């Protein structure tokens, strides 16, 4: 209720990312143009509208391997998967179009909105 | 040179608590005598020294049912489980001893520290 620990959510995310690094309790591999990325389905559901919609179905929820569209940039996905587990992203001239496209595909509204703003600032 | 999303970690935790409420992707039941609590082992590992220590062993990491000491106050546990998933605690005269004892059992050092400070101010 009234007492909050201000670093708690960030510490939880840090520890979740450590479990990912160690391959502890990971339950899915995402495949993007023949590159593989291990993850926790709970984190994917909590961060992406696409994964949320897919994994609410019990059948697709049980899948151990999930393929993304073969036109998705794996580095864009890598960037966004690391964002899920850290809250941080490098948004720069050389990657903004791939990140925005990938964030649109994953239904990550706040990243999309930020990308939009950054693109509009450069006309 | 990174960009940070200030609400991300709190939003992730909110959505994980939503998944717990809906019993989505929960992989353990924590038993305290006759009371039962469904949870995500990843969240347990990320917040409690006890759960981190036992779940480093693959054998215990695989358990679907975990029993706590039946002398544990189950509302004390419930308070602390909700804290893991929200960052928030109601700490007050009538519950502080039970919460403190439970936090010591669970090896939740920051909660124990804050309980200690609150108790000391009432001496």
């Amino acid at each position: 209720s009234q007492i909050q620990f201000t670093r708690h959510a960030s510490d939880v995310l840090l520890n979740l990312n450590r479990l990912r690094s160690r391959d502890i309790l990971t339950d899915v591999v995402i495949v993007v143009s023949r590159e593989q990325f291990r993850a926790h389905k709970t984190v994917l559901m909590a961060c992406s509208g696409l994964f949320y919609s897919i994994f609410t179905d019990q059948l697709k929820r049980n899948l151990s391997v999930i393929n993304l569209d073969p036109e998705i940039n794996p580095e864009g996905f890598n960037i966004l998967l690391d964002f899920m587990y850290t809250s941080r992203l490098n948004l720069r001239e050389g990657n903004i179009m791939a990140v925005m496209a990938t964030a649109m595909y994953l239904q990550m509204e706040h990243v999309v909105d930020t990308c939009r703003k950054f693109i509009k600032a450069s006309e | 040179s990174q960009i940070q999303f200030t609400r991300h970690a709190s939003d992730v935790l909110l959505n994980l608590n939503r998944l717990r409420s809906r019993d989505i992707l929960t992989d353990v039941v924590i038993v305290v005598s006759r009371e039962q609590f469904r949870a995500h082992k990843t969240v347990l590992m990320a917040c409690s020294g006890l759960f981190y220590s036992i779940f480093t062993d693959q054998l215990k990491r695989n358990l679907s049912v975990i029993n706590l000491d039946p002398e544990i106050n189950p509302e004390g546990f419930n308070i602390l489980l909700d804290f893991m998933y929200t960052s928030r605690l109601n700490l007050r005269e009538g519950n502080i001893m039970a919460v403190m004892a439970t936090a010591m059992y669970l090896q939740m050092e920051h909660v124990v520290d804050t309980c200690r400070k609150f108790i000391k101010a009432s001496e």
Partner: peptide, 6 residues
């Protein structure tokens, strides 16, 4: 640390 949720 801890703070008031508010």
């Amino acid at each position: 640390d801890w703070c008031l949720f508010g």
